[PDB]
Amino acid sequence: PSEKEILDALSKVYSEQVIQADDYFRQAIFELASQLEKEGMSSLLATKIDSLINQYILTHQFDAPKSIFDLSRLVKTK
């Protein structure tokens, strides 16, 4: 479960029309992916993406594109 796979999974989520259409989630994902790219992965960052993706999933009543669930899965693993 590598630093790059998570970064790519973030980018996949970021590119989603429903994420692009929403200024809070778009920027949030953008910031987390930049922190990862810059500093690498961490416990903390894992926690932050987890919280953001939980928030996205719950806010949308489990109606989220596959990539969101894919990302969610990856950061849940660690």
Numbering used by the authors: 2 to 79
Sentences from the paper on this structure:
In order to neutralize the toxic effect of the peptide on the "producing" cell the genes encoding bacteriocins are generally co-transcribed with a cognate immunity protein. A combined structural, genomic and proteomic analyses has allowed the identification and in silico characterization of a new putative immunity protein from S. pyogenes.
The crystal asymmetric unit contains 78 (out of the 102) well ordered residues and 74 water molecules. The first methionine and the 23 C-terminal residues are disordered and cannot be identified in the electron density maps. The four long helices (H1, residues 3-16; H3, 23-41; H4, 43-61; H5, 66-79) pack tightly together around a well-defined hydrophobic core. One additional short helix (H2, residues 17-22) connects helices H1 and H3. The structural comparison results suggest that Sp-PIP is most closely related to Imb2, from subgroup C. These results suggest that Sp-PIP is highly likely to function as a bacteriocin immunity protein with similarities to proteins from group C.
